[PDB]
Nucleic acid binder design. Sequence first.
DNA 1: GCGATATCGC
DNA 2: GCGATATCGC
Lengths: 71, 73
Amino acid sequence: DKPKRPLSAYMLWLNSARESIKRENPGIKVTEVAKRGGELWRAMKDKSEWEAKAAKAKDDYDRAVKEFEAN
Amino acid sequence: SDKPKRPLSAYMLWLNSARESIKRENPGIKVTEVAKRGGELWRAMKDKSEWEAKAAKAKDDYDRAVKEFEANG
DNA sequence: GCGATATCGC
DNA sequence: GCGATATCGC
Ligand code: NA
């Protein structure tokens, strides 16, 4: 099993912000959540927390890649 | 990424076999809804025994598969 | 990961 | 507790 690609900083945030978006948009569609998630993401000026996490997730992915390639 | 895949539970064997059925009975049903629906059918199923035997047999093939894999140590 | 259900302890 | 096990976009 080849490692799945790492979660992006965008997706890391979205996972954490999905209930919030749904609370503020009752009955909202998965498709519309994505569009909304993008509005909030483009608006969020300080993405440091998510960029920091995506950075480590990248490192983890790299290590899983290392382990998958050599044995 | 080479050892035997863990054997499937009675519920997963049933769902895998019923998925396409559930999907055609609810056109467009999403996977999360197929799962939701799976839980419903499973909690209500009168007799799981056939599914449990299949799960038990999958476990046996698995335990066997694991002995072969660890046979040379 | 998560959403959506449900087991099992390589 | 959680990832694996199925599924499968996001
Ligand atoms: Na249950």
